[PDB]
Each structure stands twice: as C-alpha cells, then as structure tokens.
Design a protein around this ligand. Structure first.
Ligand SMILES: *P(=O)(OC(C)C)OC(C)C
Ligand SMILES: [Ca+2]
Length: 222
C-alpha cells in the first residue's frame, strides 16, 4: 500500500467506526448520518469524528453512538454487490472546521478523474505514519474495461476500480467503508479487492452515484 500521512484534520468528513477498536471507515453525510459499507455492518457501533490518531485523544474528537443502521436491501455479501449502509447518529454532531460533512454527487464521475482515498492502516505500519494516523492516497478512476479485465465476471454496475495498473497504488486493510472523494463529491466507498502492493490489482469501490435517491429517501425516512 501507498499514499501518505494526510494531516490531522484535513479530511473533516472522515469517520472511524469503533466496536472497542477501529474496524471500518465512513463519511459524514450530514450532522445525523454516516455512510459506510454494508460489509462493515455490526451491532454496537460508536462513531468517532474528528480523529487522526485513533489511539490518542488529541483534542478534537466527538464520540457519538450509532442509533440505527440501515444496510442496503439488495446488499449481497457473496459478491459484495450494493455494498453500502447508512448509520444514524444518536445525537447530532457539531460541525466546525475539523468535522464536516461531505456532499453527495449530482452526476457520476468520468474515468480519468482523480479522487482522494482516505483511511487508516492498510495493514502496514511503517511507511511514514501510523497504522494510527489517517492516511491518504490520490488516484484516478480507471476505465471499466481495465476494471472488468482485472476481475472477470465480478464487476457490476454498482462498482468502479481505481488506482494503478499495477505497482500503481493499494490501501490494504482497515479501510473498508471509507470515502472516495472526487471534485468535492463522495463518489465511492472502499469495498474490496485484492491488491494494495500486489500487482496490478485495483481496488473496487461502491459506486455512490448509483445510490443517491435511496440515501436521500431513506435518510429522510428515518
Ligand atoms: P474491510 O476490508 O473488511 C471488513 C468487512 C471487515 O476491512 C476492514 C477490516 C477495515
Ligand atoms: Ca484521537
């Protein structure tokens, strides 16, 4: 896995989901909701906002319990199709410079476009920071071909790939459910893959522009 140390609080809509330790990432959608992967679903979530070193209290955090989890109704855990969940917060977050929502898309993104991918630990440890500090990596949306060819028979409509066609770039763990953001919109969710620094295996992401109406409705229904 590649990318670097992001900068404490440079990705204000990043969340940590903690069940007594960090187990998945997510994104603040509005002061009462988060989105993350379905794969990440579990009972007993605490949502940590404003983190950087998840192992230290450094002053900015907000810890809020989740009060409700909605996994997408046609989520399939064998193929990971529709891998997204909404998390409603027991309380509202106060938003301020370090803790901020991120906007949903109006449009889907174009291959070629360059995004930010945020999250803790791949797994590694020492590149620069900490499995402990938030890390970042920038990488382009790939073509569908490229993606499909990378994983034949597995990619659906609700996915895209991104990164580098090899020795190009891969995250690794701890990062399921975290954001992929391109020109200021949440266009992705970290979902699976089988790469990081393996070969030319991209990651695969849940294609958020697909699920905008679900999210808005649901959220407003809950
Ligand atoms: P995600 O890859 O897989 C979860 C469904 C466990 O990685 C997590 C552990 C951050
Ligand atoms: Ca902390």
């Amino acid at each position: 896995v590649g990318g670097y140390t992001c900068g404490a609080n440079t990705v204000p809509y990043q969340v940590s989901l903690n069940s007594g330790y960090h187990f998945c990432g997510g994104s603040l959608i509005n002061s009462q909701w988060v989105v993350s992967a379905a794969h990440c679903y579990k009972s007993g979530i605490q949502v940590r906002l404003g983190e950087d070193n998840i192992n230290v209290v450094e002053g900015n955090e907000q810890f809020i319990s989740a009060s409700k989890s909605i996994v997408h109704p046609s989520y399939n855990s064998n193929t990971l199709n529709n891998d997204i969940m909404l998390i409603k917060l027991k309380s509202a977050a106060s938003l301020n410079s370090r803790v901020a929502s991120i906007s949903l898309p109006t449009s889907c993104a174009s291959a070629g476009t360059q995004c930010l991918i945020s999250g803790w630990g791949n797994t590694k440890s020492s590149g620069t920071s900490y499995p402990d500090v938030l890390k970042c990596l920038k990488a382009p949306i790939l073509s569908d071909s490229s993606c499909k060819s990378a994983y034949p028979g597995q990619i659906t409509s609700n996915m895209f790939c991104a990164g580098y066609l090899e020795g190009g770039k891969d995250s690794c763990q701890g990062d399921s459910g975290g954001p992929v953001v391109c020109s200021g919109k949440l266009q992705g969710i970290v979902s699976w893959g089988s790469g990081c620094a393996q070969k030319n295996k991209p990651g695969v992401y849940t294609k958020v522009c697909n699920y905008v109406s679900w999210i808005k409705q649901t959220i407003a229904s809950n």
